[PDB]
Every structure is written in structure tokens, then in C-alpha cells.
Amino acid sequence: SLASKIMTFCFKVYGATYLQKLLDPLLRIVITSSDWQHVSFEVDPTRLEPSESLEENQRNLLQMTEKFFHA
Known part of the structure; x- marks a missing residue:
């Protein structure tokens, strides 16, 4: 639409x-x-690697996300 393209x-x-x-x-x-x-x-449980702990991945991802969210 034209309005979308204007934005x-x-x-x-x-x-x-x-x-x-x-x-x-x-x-x-x-x-x-x-x-x-x-x-x-x-x-992802299907792709989850046993080598890396799921808890470590979850905490790291959330911490990084918060930085972007605040900015």
C-alpha cells in the first residue's frame, strides 16, 4: 500500500x-x-546439544536480550 511505503x-x-x-x-x-x-x-530440545547445558544457554540469551531491550 502507499501508506506502508510512505512509512x-x-x-x-x-x-x-x-x-x-x-x-x-x-x-x-x-x-x-x-x-x-x-x-x-x-x-530447542530437538536441537539441544548435550555438550552445552540448557541452563547456561537460557541465562546468557536473556542477559544479552535485556541490553537491546533497554536501549
């Missing part, structure tokens, strides 16, 4: 810059693998 044009042209600035600090954190190291955020 899409505005959000895409203006929103893109706003998103990058807010996400910009996180870019250094994610690039840095010294602390993140190796982890899988999977909680």
Missing part, C-alpha cells in the same frame, strides 16, 4: 542512521571474542 521510506531513510548510532557501541563488544569466546544460544 517504509521514512523509517528506512531516517531510521537507519538512528539504529546505527545506538547499536554502534555494541559493535566493539560483539567483535571482541576475548570474553564471548564460544557459546550457542539454543534452547
Whole structure:
């Protein structure tokens, strides 16, 4: 619809810059693998790996999510 494209044009042209600035600090954190190291955020029982504890995956995923939600 035209109304959707009007919003899409505005959000895409203006929103893109706003998103990058807010996400910009996180870019250094994610690039840095010294602390993140190796982890899988999977909680699917079918795909669940016995090697990694389900509890560890759940807690890590929620903690990371909260950071984005607050921002």
C-alpha cells in the first residue's frame, strides 16, 4: 500500500542512521571474542546439544536480550 511505503521510506531513510548510532557501541563488544569466546544460544530440545547445558544457554540469551531491550 502507499501508506506502508510512505512509512517504509521514512523509517528506512531516517531510521537507519538512528539504529546505527545506538547499536554502534555494541559493535566493539560483539567483535571482541576475548570474553564471548564460544557459546550457542539454543534452547530447542530437538536441537539441544548435550555438550552445552540448557541452563547456561537460557541465562546468557536473556542477559544479552535485556541490553537491546533497554536501549
